[PDB]
Amino acid sequence: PPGPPGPPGPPGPGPPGPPGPPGPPG
Amino acid sequence: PPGPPGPPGPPGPGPPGPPGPPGPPGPPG
Amino acid sequence: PPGPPGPPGPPGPGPPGPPGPPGPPGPPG
Helix, strand or coil, X not given: CCCCCCCXXXXXXXXXXXXXXXXXXX | CCCCCCCCCCCCCCCCCXXXXXXXXXXXX | CCCCCCCCCCCXXXXXXXXXXXXXXXXXX
16 A cells, blocks of 8 residues: 655745834934 | 555744844934 | 555745845945
């Protein structure tokens, strides 16, 4: 009979996060 | 005889990506 | 007898990372 399913695949990092908020007033 | 190979495993975990870049310069004065 | 285990699964890309830090502070002018 078919053997067991393979293990979990690779865990590539997710996408970079969005740009941060505007800097503090000058 | 040995049965057939099993199916492909589940999609991998995968951690959060890196932090975003710094934001835009603040407002003038 | 059962066949061999399956191959590793497909890559599992994670979620978007944390927002970037605040940008630089505005100009004096």
